[PDB]
Design a protein around this ligand. Structure first.
Ligand SMILES: *[C@@H]1O[C@H](CO)[C@@H](O[C@@H]2O[C@H](CO)[C@@H](O[C@@H]3O[C@H](CO[C@H]4O[C@H](CO)[C@@H](O)[C@H](O[C@H]5O[C@H](CO)[C@@H](O)[C@H](O)[C@@H]5O[C@H]5O[C@H](CO)[C@@H](O)[C@H](O)[C@@H]5O)[C@@H]4O)[C@@H](O)[C@H](O[C@H]4O[C@H](CO)[C@@H](O)[C@H](O)[C@@H]4O[C@H]4O[C@H](CO)[C@@H](O)[C@H](O)[C@@H]4O)[C@@H]3O)[C@H](O)[C@H]2NC(C)=O)[C@H](O)[C@H]1NC(C)=O
Ligand SMILES: NS(=O)(=O)c1ccc(C(=O)N2C[C@H]3CN(C(=O)OCc4ccc(OC(F)(F)F)cc4)C[C@@H]3C2)cn1
Ligand SMILES: [Ca+2]
Ligand SMILES: [Cl-]
Ligand code: NA
Ligand code: NA
Ligand SMILES: [Zn+2]
Length: 806
């Protein structure tokens, strides 16, 4: 109930929300059907429109007008945005040459440069180039300020998940807005685009920027706007708030536009109808900047021009229907569209079985346009699993397609030509970023980055301490003129042991064998030197990784590779090796096919054993440093040490062996040498974070050998590829992956073919950031380079996407 009987007089677009049943006058009261009776009359004036004309200049103030052109308007803060242009012979902001803003030029009483976030729904990255002719204001922001060629959204690439990620620095699995439609089984409650449940506070986790600001003494404008408030009124409201007395005036503001998304859905990303929405958004930007110029704020405010996601061509006829695959289609609930999420229709049906649903949806049609996944098997770069609102069964839908449950859902519920929501690496889903103002750099292009990083920067722009979030604070310091954030590397928690030769061969009863008893002061001194670390500078190029948790581990040195061997997990946490452009690939010799050798530095008690692998009929093993890339026949023996062995399902070994035998050398050829760091990952609870020893759900049968959920590799070379990886003077280049350690290759529909036809495709899908591997391992890489730490943080957040050019 609302007592809509109170009045909005002197309360229009008030910032503090009044509690029910008292009527409201804030920019969202319309959404709640609670505005006072005179809100429209007083707060949403439209008379005479939005632009001054020559005949209005110097008028007698008529308080009924939407905006003013009277002599008094500048001091009142309510002139039409083109007032000084029409009435005082000034130029539009867009017509002024740009001039570097080296310091804030703010009016007296401004404690800090305000921040205005100008968010555009559905603004695909390629619009910046493709629509530049019809967007002069935006083009001025972009060319004069700091811009990226694109910014990567979060999955799913829908509006609320992305705007809330921009606001919090968090992945959707952590902030809780995991979709446009959600069911939360704990609350037994449903979230929909339409209606009222979405306003309930329990949906919205983390700490958004407006709360971070308010808690730390910084006043915020109200971020959300009711759809019926015209964009011109949103802009005039921000400009009026900026004219408030110092003690009342917010320092941070948001504008939101439902275009170009609204038209994009109807017309497709490049429909001829799309030119008009782009023109109109550019005109809104011009009103804002002209309005700032009038207020002498255009060289004081930092402006961010940012999108939530892009837009793809999608039509009704490109829908896959689960009723073409499932016999039981009425026993499931599907969240449909550009992703799919499946659960049981009834928690009382004891015949529902996820395994049979997954199988019925796996590789059933030759050009099948979705792929099913248990959520823990989704690419780790999506960070899309650790939330009870994410159903266990997920469908990743191909770009340009939809999935639905039955045909009747699609013609009884073609209209549309555009949609979005797909995997966040897809080029059509990318969006935009430009920052313009005293705190941003001048005419500077920065490489693409993820939207999870912007919360930290917006906190930096406002002098706020960010709440804990998923950005890597400092990784975007290269966007900023000042207010950079200069973190320290984390402290190493566990220091390594450096064991020498401590055990005799006969102490080992591991069930292993090796034909290695084919046996000199020249060469014998030389091999001892290798075991002491004499080649470590060649194979450990960026220093050893730091271990950021308490554990017991040993550094093991070899001719061709160095490793950090865990006594707790009985395998390396990491193995590091460099392959030059000229390296030679060799075979595993016949006499070494089944060779596994005890490592006389490491106790039998802290070693794997071969008997467990013989007994485990599902499990085989592979090696982290590949025998194929040994530097000599003698060095090759080191690769068969029990301390280089890891558990691998036979299906996964097809993948791993191809990577090791073929792809490492191919990368070394292409990149002028590579350094590789590989290792296991254990994430049985799919939270994106390193498991402790008591979270491991699967062991090699009979043993205490834990089974990795994933294997990673980080592949680093010189950005300037005219320099070899091991003698690089400048910036680095990296690509990495996190491959799921699965007992089948069901994920790859062409896996019956030669690995050259499917393995690299698999690896591209599971591309990763170094930072993703850090979270999953508790290791910290690149500790010893000649590079700035902020540069290294940017390197660690890089994702190699394998998409063609934007
Ligand atoms: C991305 O960045 C974020 C932010 O930094 C990282 O998320 C953090 O990760 C931590 C580890 O997972 C997690 O720490 C836990 O906090 C618990 C207290 O939680 C409440 O308070 C915080 C602080 O204000 C608040 O933010 C939380 O908000 C969550 O929960 C509500 C819903 O319940 C949501 O509205 C909101 O969206 C958010 O949900 C997300 O996080 C939770 C986990 O907290 C998930 O379950 C959801 O799916 C969703 O992802 C909370 O309101 C605290 O209770 C935990 O402590 C237990 O475990 C530790 C292990 O160290 C142990 O020491 C403790 O003793 C304790 O154990 C006891 O509880 C166990 C579980 O019941 C039980 O098994 C034991 O037997 C014990 O009794 C834990 O410290 C932190 O909350 C989140 N923060 C956020 C905002 O998500 C995230 O990891 C980053 N991601 C990556 C990939 O790096
Ligand atoms: N395109 S879609 O996914 O189908 C879709 C979903 C939801 C809808 C839909 O009805 N909405 C009603 C709109 C009103 N909103 C609003 O005023 O947002 C202000 C805002 C908030 C946070 C921001 O980020 C920051 F904090 F700055 F970092 C920036 C701006 C956004 C809502 C989406 C429309 N389309
Ligand atoms: Ca984990
Ligand atoms: Cl959704
Ligand atoms: Na076996
Ligand atoms: Na297959
Ligand atoms: Zn949309």
């Amino acid at each position: 109930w609302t007592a809509t009987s109170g009045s909005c007089k002197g309360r229009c677009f008030e910032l503090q929300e009044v509690g029910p049943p008292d009527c409201r006058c804030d920019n969202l009261c319309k959404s709640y059907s609670s505005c006072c009776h005179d809100f429209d009359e007083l707060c949403l004036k439209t008379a005479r429109g939005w632009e001054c004309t020559k005949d209005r200049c110097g008028e007698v103030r008529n308080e009924e007008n939407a905006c003013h052109c009277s002599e008094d308007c500048l001091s009142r803060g309510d002139c039409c945005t083109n007032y000084q242009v029409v009435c005082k012979g000034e130029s539009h902001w867009v017509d002024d040459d740009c001039e570097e803003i080296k310091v804030p030029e703010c009016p007296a009483g401004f404690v800090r440069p305000p921040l205005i976030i100008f968010s555009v729904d559905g603004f695909r990255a390629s619009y910046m180039k493709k629509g530049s002719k019809v967007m002069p204001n935006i083009e001025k922001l972009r060319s004069c300020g700091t811009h990226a060629p694109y910014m990567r959204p979060v999955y799913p690439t829908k509006t609320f998940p992305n705007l809330y990620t921009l606001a919090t620095g968090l992945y959707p699995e952590s902030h809780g807005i995991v979709g446009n439609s959600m069911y939360d089984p704990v609350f037994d409650a449903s979230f929909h685009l339409r209606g009222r449940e979405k306003f309930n506070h329990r949906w919205w986790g983390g700490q958004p920027l407006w709360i971070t600001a308010t808690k730390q003494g910084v006043r915020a404008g109200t971020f959300f706007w009711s759809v019926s408030i015209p964009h011109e009124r949103r802009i005039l409201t921000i400009l009026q708030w900026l004219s408030l007395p110092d003690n009342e005036r917010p320092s941070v503001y948001a504008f939101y536009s439902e275009q170009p998304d609204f038209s994009g859905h109807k017309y497709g990303p490049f429909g001829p109808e799309m030119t008009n929405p782009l023109r109109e958004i550019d005109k809104t930007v011009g009103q804002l900047m002209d309005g700032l110029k009038q207020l002498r704020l255009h060289r004081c405010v930092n402006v961010i021009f940012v999108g939530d996601h892009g837009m793809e061509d999608v039509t009704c006829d490109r829908t896959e229907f689960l009723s073409n695959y499932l016999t039981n289609v009425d026993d499931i609930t599907l969240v449909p569209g550009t992703l799919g999420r499946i659960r049981a229709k009834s928690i009382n049906n004891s015949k529902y079985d996820p395994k049979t649903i997954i199988a019925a949806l796996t590789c059933k049609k030759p050009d099948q346009h979705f792929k099913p996944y248990m959520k823990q098997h989704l690419p780790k770069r999506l960070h899309y699993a650790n939330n009870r609102r994410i159903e266990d069964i997920h469908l990743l839908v191909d770009r340009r397609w939809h999935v639905a449950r039955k045909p009747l859902d699609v013609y009884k519920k073609c209209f549309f030509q555009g949609d979005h929501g797909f995997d966040n690496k897809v080029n059509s889903m990318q969006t935009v970023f430009v920052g313009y103002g005293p705190t941003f750099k001048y005419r500077t292009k920065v490489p693409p980055f993820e939207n999870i990083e912007l919360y930290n920067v917006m906190c930096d722009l406002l002098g706020l301490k960010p709440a804990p979030n998923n950005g890597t604070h400092g990784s975007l310091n290269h966007l900023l003129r000042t207010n950079t954030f200069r973190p320290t590397m984390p402290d190493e928690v566990s220091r390594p042991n450096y064991p020498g030769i401590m055990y005799l061969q006969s102490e080992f009863d591991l069930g292993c064998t090796c034909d290695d008893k084919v046996e000199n002061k020249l060469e014998e001194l030389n091999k001892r030197l290798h075991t002491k670390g004499s080649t470590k500078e060649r194979h450990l190029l960026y220093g050893r990784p730091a271990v950021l948790y308490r554990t017991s581990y040993d550094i093991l040195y070899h001719t061709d590779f160095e490793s950090g061997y865990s006594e707790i997990f009985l395998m390396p946490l990491w193995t590091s090796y460099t392959i030059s452009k000229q390296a030679e690939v060799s075979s595993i010799p016949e006499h070494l096919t089944n060779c596994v050798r005890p490592d006389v530095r490491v106790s039998p008690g802290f070693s794997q054993n071969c008997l467990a692998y013989k007994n485990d009929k599902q499990m085989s093993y592979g090696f982290l440093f590949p025998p194929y890339l040994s530097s000599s026949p003698e060095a090759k023996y080191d690769a068969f040490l029990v301390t280089n062995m890891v558990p691998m399902y036979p299906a996964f070994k097809r993948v791993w062996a191809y990577f090791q035998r073929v792809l490492v050398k191919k990368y070394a050829s292409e990149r002028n040498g590579v350094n590789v760091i590989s290792g296991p990952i254990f994430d049985y609870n799919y939270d994106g974070l390193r498991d402790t020893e008591d979270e491991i759900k699967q062991y090699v049968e009979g043993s205490s050998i834990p089974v990795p959920t994933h294997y990673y590799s980080i592949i680093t070379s010189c950005l300037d590829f005219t320099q070899p990886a091991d003698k690089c003077d400048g910036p680095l280049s990296v690509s990495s992956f996190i491959l799921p350690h699965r007992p089948d290759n069901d994920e790859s529909c062409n896996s019956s073919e030669d690995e050259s036809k499917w393995v690299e495709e698999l690896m591209k899908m599971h591309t990763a950031r170094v930072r993703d591997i850090e979270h999953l391992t508790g290791l910290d890489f690149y500790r010893k380079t000649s590079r700035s730490y902020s540069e290294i943080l940017t390197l660690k957040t890089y994702l190699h996407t394998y998409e063609s050019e934007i």
